[PDB]
Amino acid sequence: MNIFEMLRIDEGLRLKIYKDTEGYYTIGIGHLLTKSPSLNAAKSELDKAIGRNTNGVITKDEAEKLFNQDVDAAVRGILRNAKLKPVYDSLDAVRRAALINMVFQMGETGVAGFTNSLAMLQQKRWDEAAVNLAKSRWYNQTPNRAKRVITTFRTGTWDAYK
Binding residues for substrate: 32, 104, 117, 132
Say whether 11 is catalytic: yes
Site string for Cl ion, 27-66 (x = CB under 5 A): ----------------------x-----------------
- Shortest Cβ 69–Cl ion spacing (Å): 6
7 exposure class (CB count in 10 Å sphere: 0-12, 13-18, 19+) = buried
Length, in residues, of the chain: 162
Say whether 45 is catalytic: no
Annotated binding site: 32, 104, 117, 132
Residue 138 neighbours by CB distance under 10 Å: 20
Instruction: Report how far residue 136's alpha carbon sits from residue 127's, in angstroms, rounded to the nearest whole number.
Output: 16
Stretch binding Cl ion (CB under 5 A), from 3-11, 37-45, 120-128, 137-145? 137-145
Residue 17 neighbours by CB distance under 10 Å: 21
Paired residues of 26 in beta bridges: 18, 32
Site string for Cl ion, 85-124 (x = CB under 5 A): ----------------------------------------
| Residues in touch with Cl ion (CB under 5 A) | 49, 142, 144-145
